[PDB]
Each structure stands twice: as structure tokens, then as C-alpha cells.
Amino acid sequence: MTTSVFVSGATGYLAQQIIALVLSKGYKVVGSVRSEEKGANLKKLYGDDFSYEVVKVLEQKGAFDEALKKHPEVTIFLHTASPVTFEVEDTEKEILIPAINGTKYVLQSIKDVAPQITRVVYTSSVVAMSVPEELGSPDVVLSEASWSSLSYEQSKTHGVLAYFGSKQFAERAAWEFVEQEKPNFALSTVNPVYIFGPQAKDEEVKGTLNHSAEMVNSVLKLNKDDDVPATTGTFIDVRDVAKAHLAAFEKDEAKGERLLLSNTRFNGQTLLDVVRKNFPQLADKLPVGKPHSDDFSAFKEWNDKKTKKILGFEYFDFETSVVDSIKQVLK
Incomplete structure (x- = not known):
């Protein structure tokens, strides 16, 4: 009767915007948080239609299994969360592997424990699509087809390149899971640029x-x-990104799509x-x-x-x- 949407990394700036929108639409949200206090705060914020589960380490195998088992009511998964790293000592170990592993492991849990989930929306980035010098270039045209050229090897070299690589490899991993594991859900991505805009609360x-x-x-x-x-x-408004997430699970045409969220x-x-x-x-x-x-x-x-045509709204x-x-x- 009411549809329940799981949202990972629920305290996040984007995630909160997504949650607000979705609640405004009459969905329920089940949110993952890294501690009870975080959840309780979110609950106080968002109310009766919001519930939470504690998932401390996102990149751990089986991490979402219990939360998922507990919520047979959920049929949508918005995977917004990224690994939190505070200063990086080893790029591969702390950035690349956690990013990649997390995506695979979350998808595996959903397949394993939530067969009822019909839509998964993975929050990616423009950084998947490109390299930093190309981002700034007036000769460069990105599209939904665009995949970053950055190698695994180069990605290790620098913290910036590592963040770029981490997203690229993780998103590739998600599509690869769909190809290989053939789950019940249809996958879709949202690929934002620099995000600006007010916070949800x-x-x-x-x-x-x-x-x-x-x-x-x-x-x-x-x-x-x-x-x-x-x-x-390029910029995009956080509200537009959120709306893109909504469309990404709501619309038939978004199934198996990458959505490029970029404005001016x-x-x-x-x-x-x-x-x-x-x-x-x-x-x-x-x-x-x-x-x-x-x-x-x-x-x-x-x-x-293509993204604007699928979305069908105008940006802030x-x-x-x-x-x-x-x-x-x-x-």
C-alpha cells in the first residue's frame, strides 16, 4: 500500500534531500546510519514514516544483510553512501577497495536477502565519467555514455585520482553485477557534478x-x-539531484540508465x-x-x-x- 525505500548513508547532505523528497511523496524510508544517535536524530527530524538501521561499516561483506532481513516491506534501494575516510595513508586499501567492495557487497546482500527489491539506484559521479583535466576543458563533451579513462594503476597515485578511480571502479562494478548476477532489480545511476544548495533541515x-x-x-x-x-x-542543485533519484526509481525509462546531472x-x-x-x-x-x-x-x-528527456523537469x-x-x- 505504501512503498518503502531504503536509503543508505541517511545522514548525508544528498541523502537527506532525497529522504525529504521521498517522504513528501508519501513513501516510507528505511535509512541506514552508522550509530543509533544518528538515527534518532534523523527520526526526530523526519518523523513517523522514517525508520533506521545501524550499519557501521558499509564496505564489509554482509553489511546490509540484517537490516534488509528486517525490512521485507522494502522494494527500492537508493544506495547513496560512500566510505568515510579522514586522511588517507594507503589509497588502494582505504579508498579503492572499500569503494569497489562496498558496491559489490551491497548489491549481493540485496540479491541475497531482499529479492523483493525491484529497483536499485546507485549514486555515482561525473568523476566516473572523466578525468580532471577533461572536466575543465571547453573542448570536452560528456554524455551518459562517458566513462573515465583513468586506470586502476594511475588511480592509486594520488588522493584525487583515487577518489576519481574509486567512483569509476565502483560504478563499473555495479553494472558488472547486473550483467553477471542477473538480479530481480533493475539498476540505475545518478552521476552528479559539483553539488550546491540548501540542506534539507x-x-x-x-x-x-x-x-x-x-x-x-x-x-x-x-x-x-x-x-x-x-x-x-559545472554545478547542479542538490534538489535536482534528489529529484533525479526519484525519477530513477519511478520511471520505466530510467531502467538501466546512467543519468548525467549537470547544469551550468x-x-x-x-x-x-x-x-x-x-x-x-x-x-x-x-x-x-x-x-x-x-x-x-x-x-x-x-x-x-537523454537525461533531461527522462527527467522531464527544469533545473534550479x-x-x-x-x-x-x-x-x-x-x-
């Missing part, structure tokens, strides 16, 4: 005034003398120009740069046409996403 904006994506808040801590931030790429290009100047206009009280302590010096006109538009613009984040932080 005010209470969560803790510590008061923060930033993931931090890039929003690399700026607000700047000082008038500081440089304009370097960071540049930005740089530090784009960000600064927005903040400065919208929140003038902070302009005195902020840098100026060269306003509206950002010109992205040479950049080839990415090919997300950049200004709106940024303004909404700051307003909340300020509040």
Missing part, C-alpha cells in the same frame, strides 16, 4: 554556518584582500558576483575580483539530452541554488 546546518559543498563557503570566509577562488566546473558552468568569480549582489552586507570584507569577467561561451555544451539556476544555501546558513 535547518537543524542540520551544523556547525552553524558551514560548507559541503564547501566551495560555497570557501568564499564566505574570504577577506577583502584574498584572491578570487580558483574553483571551476561557474567559477569563483561567478560565485563571488552572486554573493556580493545578494548579501551586500558581506561585500565589505569580501574580494571584488573582476565582476562578470567569467566567460564560458567557448565551452561546448555537455550532452545530457546557479544564483538560486547559491542564494538559497547562504540564506539558510545566515538564518
Whole structure:
């Protein structure tokens, strides 16, 4: 009668947005959390239709088996969680293997213990699709077809490349599971770019005034003398990503799809120009740069046409996403 959706890594910024949307739709959520207190907090936040299970180590074999066994009511699994690593000493051991193993193990548990699950949505990234130099290139057109060229070997070399590799290999693992193991569920992925936007709950904006994506808040801590931030790429609003997750399990056309979630290009100047206009009280302590010096006109538009057609909604613009984040932080 009511449909129950499992969401891994439920305390996450995206996950919370997904959970809020889904609850708003009348689904139930069963959320995984790494501790009871995390769950209880989520419960207090999200209410009666929210339940939780504690799964401490996501990449462990059999990790989700008990939680799954307990929830025969669940028929959707949104796998949003990533391994939490705090500073990395060995890239393979701590980043690549956990990412890859986790995906395989979670899928195996679902097949093993939740045969009733008909849809799995795996949260991937644009980093699966590409390499860092290609991300910044005006000659590059990504699509839903795009797979990163980065090798396993190269991925080990650096922490950045490792994060890139980890997503690529993990997503490949997920598709591979589907091919090889042939489960009851249809798989789909969501592949976001830099995510901006408000948090699902005010209470969560803790510590008061923060930033993931931090890039929003690399700026607000700047000082008038500081440089304009370097960071540049494509953005997407967290709400749009969430809506993509919804469509990814709801729509027949999304079955076996990769969804590229990417909106407009930005740089530090784009960000600064927005903040400065919208929140003038902070302009005195902020840098100026060269306003509206950002010109992205040479950049080839990415090919997300299939994804937009499947999604069938229009995205939040950049200004709106940024303004909404700051307003909340300020509040």
C-alpha cells in the first residue's frame, strides 16, 4: 500500500534531500546510519514514516544483510553512501577497495536477502565519467555514455585520482553485477557534478554556518584582500539531484540508465558576483575580483539530452541554488 525505500548513508547532505523528497511523496524510508544517535536524530527530524538501521561499516561483506532481513516491506534501494575516510595513508586499501567492495557487497546482500527489491539506484559521479583535466576543458563533451579513462594503476597515485578511480571502479562494478548476477532489480545511476544548495533541515546546518559543498563557503570566509577562488566546473542543485533519484526509481525509462546531472558552468568569480549582489552586507570584507569577467561561451555544451528527456523537469539556476544555501546558513 505504501512503498518503502531504503536509503543508505541517511545522514548525508544528498541523502537527506532525497529522504525529504521521498517522504513528501508519501513513501516510507528505511535509512541506514552508522550509530543509533544518528538515527534518532534523523527520526526526530523526519518523523513517523522514517525508520533506521545501524550499519557501521558499509564496505564489509554482509553489511546490509540484517537490516534488509528486517525490512521485507522494502522494494527500492537508493544506495547513496560512500566510505568515510579522514586522511588517507594507503589509497588502494582505504579508498579503492572499500569503494569497489562496498558496491559489490551491497548489491549481493540485496540479491541475497531482499529479492523483493525491484529497483536499485546507485549514486555515482561525473568523476566516473572523466578525468580532471577533461572536466575543465571547453573542448570536452560528456554524455551518459562517458566513462573515465583513468586506470586502476594511475588511480592509486594520488588522493584525487583515487577518489576519481574509486567512483569509476565502483560504478563499473555495479553494472558488472547486473550483467553477471542477473538480479530481480533493475539498476540505475545518478552521476552528479559539483553539488550546491540548501540542506534539507535547518537543524542540520551544523556547525552553524558551514560548507559541503564547501566551495560555497570557501568564499564566505574570504577577506577583502584574498584572491578570487580558483574553483571551476559545472554545478547542479542538490534538489535536482534528489529529484533525479526519484525519477530513477519511478520511471520505466530510467531502467538501466546512467543519468548525467549537470547544469551550468561557474567559477569563483561567478560565485563571488552572486554573493556580493545578494548579501551586500558581506561585500565589505569580501574580494571584488573582476565582476562578470567569467566567460564560458567557448565551452561546448555537455550532452545530457537523454537525461533531461527522462527527467522531464527544469533545473534550479546557479544564483538560486547559491542564494538559497547562504540564506539558510545566515538564518
